[PDB]
Amino acid sequence: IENRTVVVTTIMESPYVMYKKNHEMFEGNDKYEGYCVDLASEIAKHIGIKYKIAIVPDGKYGARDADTKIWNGMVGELVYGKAEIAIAPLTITLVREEVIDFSKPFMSLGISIMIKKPQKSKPFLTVERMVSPIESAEDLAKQTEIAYGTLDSGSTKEFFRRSKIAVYEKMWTYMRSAEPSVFTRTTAEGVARVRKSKGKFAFLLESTMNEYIEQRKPCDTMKVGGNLDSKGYGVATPKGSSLRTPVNLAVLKLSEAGVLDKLKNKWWYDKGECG
Amino acid sequence: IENRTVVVTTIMESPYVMYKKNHEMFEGNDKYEGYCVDLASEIAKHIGIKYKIAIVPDGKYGARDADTKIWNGMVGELVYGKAEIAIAPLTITLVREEVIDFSKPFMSLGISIMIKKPQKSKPGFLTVERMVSPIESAEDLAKQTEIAYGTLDSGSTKEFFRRSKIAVYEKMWTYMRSAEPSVFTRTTAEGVARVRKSKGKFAFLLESTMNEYIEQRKPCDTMKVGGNLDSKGYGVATPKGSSLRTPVNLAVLKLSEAGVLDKLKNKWWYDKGECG
Amino acid sequence: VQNRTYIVTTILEDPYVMLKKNANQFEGNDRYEGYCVELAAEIAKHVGYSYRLEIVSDGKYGARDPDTKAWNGMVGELVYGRADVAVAPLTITLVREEVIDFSKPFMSLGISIMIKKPVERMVSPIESAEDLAKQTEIAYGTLEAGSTKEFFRRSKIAVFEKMWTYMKSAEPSVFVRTTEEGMIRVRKSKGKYAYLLESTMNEYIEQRKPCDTMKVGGNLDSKGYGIATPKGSALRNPVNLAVLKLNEQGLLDKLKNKWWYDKGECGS
Amino acid sequence: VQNRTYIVTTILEDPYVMLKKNANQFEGNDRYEGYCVELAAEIAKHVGYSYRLEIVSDGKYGARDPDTKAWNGMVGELVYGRADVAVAPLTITLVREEVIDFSKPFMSLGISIMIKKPVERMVSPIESAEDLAKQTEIAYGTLEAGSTKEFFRRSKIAVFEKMWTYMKSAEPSVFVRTTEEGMIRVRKSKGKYAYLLESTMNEYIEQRKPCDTMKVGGNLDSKGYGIATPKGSALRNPVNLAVLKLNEQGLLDKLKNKWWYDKGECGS
Ligand SMILES: NS(=O)(=O)c1cccc2c1c([N+](=O)[O-])cc1[nH]c(=O)c(=O)[nH]c12
Ligand SMILES: NS(=O)(=O)c1cccc2c1c([N+](=O)[O-])cc1[nH]c(=O)c(=O)[nH]c12
Ligand SMILES: NS(=O)(=O)c1cccc2c1c([N+](=O)[O-])cc1[nH]c(=O)c(=O)[nH]c12
Ligand SMILES: NS(=O)(=O)c1cccc2c1c([N+](=O)[O-])cc1[nH]c(=O)c(=O)[nH]c12
């Protein structure tokens, strides 16, 4: 199990995997570092196997095409034998589960509200308390002087289109009826819009990226409110593979040992630029 | 080694070695716990030798007698072969190194000024309150005479002032000798009680380590101020010519470099302190 | 898998499984009401089997006996084949997953802080583990023998380590024998005690009368309840897929709202 | 041990050994003045031997070459028998003690914090390691390759570990090539930089012009200088006893005061 080298497909997306400094003089797995790289190292230690990181050429997480019925991304690589392990942020989704087997979630996340950091507004003085105009999703939906949106596809838009709790239904109604267009092509564009709008726009993106962006310069974004829904990231393995059980037990042992929390803290706050 | 169990003599004095809770149901070394007990544990692990803690019956640290020329206490027990290692607060001193050999100091200390914690004095800005210490160092202690300063009636602390030639520590000795009534105390506990009772009008000059230990005890009415007047060390004494000198010395040095000694000092001073 | 009724095993824990106020005029599955009963009904609807609710006799979550190496409670009933499906708040852990198969978590939780609901603008309520660690006026404690105390015992984080050293060097011991006694003591402590317990229980206690406790801060760790089956059971895939469908369609988040806030005795 | 002159090894370090302003009208031991020269004179008086001061050629404290396993500097001179006594600021450590014999420390030491000497009442100057760890406005750094950086690298204390992680994840690198450049940087930083160096050098620099730096806080660790001899040398016991006598009678403290404050160019 150690002589053979497995293909560990992964996606180039910070802070999970980034180009290491002076990566040209490194070779193999040393060129990439991040949360996912170290998680792969720990998992390979637990299973006692040798691995090589192979970034997926397509650059997509994974979805099934409409007419051709061919899977793409890491899910496509796992299905068609390109790789065997997919240590990367891959949301445990029903449609992804029907073809491949997911392990237990190594990090829990959900849709979170992103707002610009509160600042001294131009119109007791010893101490200053910054009051956030939004406290949760209910306050965001009740008052409509602020605009809020999400990326033009993915899990968030479908979740708002599908929710029936009558609050996110109203949120979806406002989002669809809003003029001009509120959806953003990319998450980076949405963050730029939030920063540029001077606190007049909010972004509904997943909590992990929200916390990562909050700890980056110019430190002008913050996380507010609890998670609207619940999801998780899984270490996907192909259906019927013999590596499912060792991977699952390795993730569970790492989660109980506190190594996962150590990694998240180290790559979110310890290496953050607003610390 | 583990050839035989050695007699590790120690003195019953907190926080180095204290009676453990429910010590009757424990046996051997488990009855005693403290900084010195743990230090003995690490030293015996480093040398790989089994040991047994045996408190000296006399209860004294050790000093040469005037007439019989006999050695008492821990130094006496080491000299006459009743023990082999003394892991205790035994100060490295010239007259104690003429009969036995000391290792490197595992803890540095010196004479320190003890004063009652500043309080809300009765009046004769209000948002934050700064407690100003009336005394900051030995120079201010000697310059101002509204507060009397005392020491222990027979020890290294008094002999340091008797033998010192620096102007500050000579004026201090002169005032302390000419002070009325008697300023020297009988025991350290009695001196601490006098400091606490005098409502901050009396300062006591005792060892820095004990000052830090007492400061972290209830009712948080004592504190340390100023730097150490002199420098001394606490050593793990071994008898002269013993083969255990070098392993003990290297073990203490390794423990000091590894930071284990600082960890133990923190654990037994601040972590287990009752004051905060 | 038809013409056969399965024996579901679940514990009486609120809001999960609670006896109805009209218990003595109802029989069968109609005796019990709660989050887990509705979850079992929906899972049986999706998978397509008939089931009967049965309670574990000893009323405990599964633990491994250090002497006999035997499993008790719902996990023990699952391992020895006495029951088929355990739709209950059974936490996913390394030890249990070695013997039984857990579905994907239908409810995420973690360790949280519960405090009594209360120079003047400078005061700040506790909102994180660091604030509780750096402040000592208000004591905090956990269950005397539970996963929370063990978590602070084995934790490698500096903040949690300092917290644990505070717990182990403080008297009287704040560790309370039971959860009910813990919440009673917190209520009677008048803000001088914070109890560290599971997030779901803290949220439900927040919604219980007389509404004098609140939950602050995020989850210190990450856990998740699960629906366990015996290893090699034929219902692993249908149950997992059903749980995923309820997670995406929002049925689990609807039952949570129904049994936590909609039927809560407190306003929000 | 008479009719023989001993070659004594020492290094040019201020104020331990300094060249006199009248150096070129003096010869022999009269060329050098400082704390260590007077210490050597007193030790030679007490033990009763004739000695000649000889400065180490390469001017370094002893370190072990990883690839040749050879000792350089004063320690290297001691091991190979070129010199007899090293009355110099030579720190007692585990590695050096394994090859040479150190006397009892004649001067305690430790890691100190060096800063430029400067809601108003609420401000708090840095006075301990915890204050420097919790506050990040003022960057702090040590020598690029020294015992201080290694100490913070290997330290197991939580505060020191957090400080080390702060240093290793900060740019530009605050670590300074040499002590003089570090002191100049502290002078020119206007209170935005704190230098972590040995306590004796911090105290001596505090008594140097233009007196814009000060030492604050206690020693983070415990170290001590020593007077080393080759292993098995016949002068170990006389040197140890002489050091103890000078320590008890206050001669060591008197020389330290004379060469730190009495001859200092700064008021106190
Ligand atoms: N908020 S984000 O930074 O951009 C983002 C960050 C991280 C993982 C994402 C993700 C987004 N997305 O576009 O919404 C979609 C998506 N879809 C998957 O299937 C998956 O596995 N992971 C993801
Ligand atoms: N200030 S104290 O708490 O009571 C005290 C504490 C600890 C060690 C002491 C000591 C005193 N003392 O009485 O001054 C004298 C003394 N003499 C020695 O020879 C020795 O080794 N250790 C000590
Ligand atoms: N909420 S509680 O009373 O304070 C509670 C306290 C302590 C342990 C619990 C627990 C609850 N629970 O949710 O009912 C469920 C549960 N499930 C497991 O599998 C396990 O191991 N430990 C527990
Ligand atoms: N002057 S310094 O910048 O603070 C200093 C920096 C770095 C290493 C030092 C050192 C000093 N010192 O105090 O003269 C003495 C010394 N002695 C040893 O034996 C050794 O190994 N390393 C050192």
Written as one string, the DSSP assignment of chain D is --S-EEEEEE--BTTTBEE-TTGGG--GGGGEESHHHHHHHHHHHHHT-EEEEEE-SS-----B-TTT--B-HHHHHHHTTS-SBEEEB----HHHHTTEEE---SSEE-EEEEEE----TT-----SHHHHHH--SSEEE-BSSSHHHHHHHH--SHHHHHHHHHHHT-SS---BSSHHHHHHHHHHTTTSEEEEEEHHHHHHHHTSTT--EEEES--SS-EE-EEEEETT-TTHHHHHHHHHHHHHTTHHHHHHHIIIIIS-SS--
- Which residues, including other chains, have CB under 8 Å from residue C88's CB and lie 6 or more apart? C9, C10, C11, C13, C16, C17, C36, C74, C225, C227
* Closest to C157 measured CA to CA, from B95, A264, B89: A264
Residue keyed to tokens 């110019």: A218
Fold agreement (B6-108+233-271, B111-225): yes
CATH of domain B6-108+233-271: 3.40.190.10
Domain extent listing, chain B: 6-108+233-271, 111-225
Binding residue numbers of C for L-glutamate? 89, 91, 96, 147-148, 198
**Distance in angstroms between the alpha carbons of the first and the last residue of chain A:** 42
- C146 CA: distance to closest CA in chain B (Å): 25
C·D CB contacts under 8 A: 5
Three-state SS at B111: strand
Q: Is the CB of A42 under 6 A from ligand 1?
A: no
* CATH code at C111-216: 3.40.190.10
Determine, for residues C169 and B271 on separate chains, whether the beta-carbon distance falls below 8 Å: yes
Please give the CATH superfamily to which domain C5-108+224-262 belongs. Answer: Periplasmic binding protein-like II (3.40.190.10)
* Alpha carbon separation from A183 to A211, A227, C227 (Å, rounded): 21, 20, 37
Compute CA distances C140 → C137, C170, D111, whole Å.
10, 10, 36
Question: Is A275 in contact with D165 (Cβ distance < 8 A)?
Answer: no
User: Which residue's CA lies nearest to atom 3 of ligand 1?
Assistant: A209
- Beta-carbon contacts of B48 under 8 Å, excluding residues fewer than 6 positions away, are B1, B2
D148 is in an annotated binding site: yes
Q: For residue B125, list its beta bridge partners.
A: none
Say yes or no: domain A5-107+231-270 is CATH 3.40.190.10. Answer: yes
* Contacting residues of B for D156, CB less than 8 Å apart: 259, 263
Query: Residue B182 corresponds to which tokens in the numbers above?
Result: 């008697």
The alpha carbon of residue A74 and the mean position of all alpha carbons in its chain are separated, in whole angstroms, by: 15
Phi-psi sector, B251: left (phi>0), alpha (psi -120 to 50), beta: alpha
Exp. method: cryo-EM
Residue from the list A126, A270, A271 with its beta carbon closest to the beta carbon of D119:
A126
Decide if D214 contacts D206 (C-beta within 8 A): yes
Candidate CATH numbers 3.90.1300.10, 3.40.190.10, 3.40.50.150, 1.10.10.10; the one for domain B111-225: 3.40.190.10
User: DSSP string spanning C158-225?
Assistant: HHHHHHHHHHHT-SS---BSSHHHHHHHHHHHTTSEEEEEEHHHHHHHHTSTT--EEEES--SS-EEE
Q: In this structure, which residue's CA is closest to atom 1 in ligand 4? A: D201
Q: What does the radius of gyration of chain A's CA atoms come to, in whole angstroms?
A: 20
- Burial (0-12, 13-18, 19+ Cβ within 10 Å), D199: buried
Contact D9, D78 (CB under 8 A): yes
Question: What is the CATH number that goes with domain D5-107+225-262?
Answer: 3.40.190.10
CA distance C155 to chain D (A): 14
Between chain A and chain D, the number of residue pairs with CB atoms below 8 A apart is: 5
The answer to whether residue C237 neighbours chain A at the CB level (below 8 Å) is no
**Nearest chain C Cα distance for residue B274, angstroms:** 9
Enumerate the CATH 3.40.190.10 domain ranges in chain C, comma separated.
Answer: 5-108+224-262, 111-216
Q: Do residues C109 and C224 touch, judged by C-beta distance below 8 A? A: yes
Q: Which CATH class is domain A111-224?
A: alpha beta
What single string gives the DSSP state of each residue in A177-203? H-SS---BSSHHHHHHHHHHTTTSEEE
H/E segment holding residue B94? helix B94-97
Residue numbers followed by a gap, chain B, C–N over 2.5 Å: 124
DSSP character for B37? H
B neighbours by CB contacts (3+ pairs under 8 Å): C, D
CA–CA gap between residue D181 and residue C5 (Å, rounded): 83
Resolution to 1 decimal place, in Å: 3.5
- Which residues does chain C have within 8 Å of residue D158's beta carbon, measured at their own beta carbons? 158, 161-162
- Rounded Cα–Cα distance for residues A214 and A218 (Å): 9
How far is CA B269 from each of CA B3, B23, B209, B214, rounded to the nearest angstrom? 35, 22, 9, 9
Q: Ligand 1: which residue has its CA nearest to atom 22?
A: A90
Residue A229: closest CA among C256, C55, C121, B233: C256
Residues of chain D with CATH 3.40.190.10: 5-107+225-262, 110-216
The b-or-e profile of C153-169 (16+ CB within 10 A means b, else e) is eebebebbbbbbebbee
Site of tokens 């006459």: B80
| Strand, coil or helix: A37 | helix
Check if the beta carbon of residue A5 is closer than 8 Å to that of residue A50. yes
Q: How far is the CA of A137 from the centre of ligand 1 (A)?
A: 21
Instruction: Quote the CA–CA distance of B18 and B32 in Å, as a whole number.
Output: 6
CA A26 from chain center: how many Å?
27
Cβ atoms of A90 and A61 closer than 8 Å: yes
Segments in B104-222 forming alpha helices (H): 138-143, 156-163, 167-178, 188-197, 208-215
DSSP per residue over A71-114, as a string? B-HHHHHHHTTS-SBB-S--B--HHHHTTEE----SEEE-EEEE
**Both structure tokens of C44:** 């049986």
- Compute the distance from residue D52 Cα to the ligand 4 centre, in Å: 24
- Among A256, A259, A262, A265, the strongest candidate for a mutation testing the C interface, having the largest count of C CBs within 10 A, is A256
d(CA B17, CA D126): 35
Architecture of D110-216 per CATH?
3-Layer(aba) Sandwich (3.40)
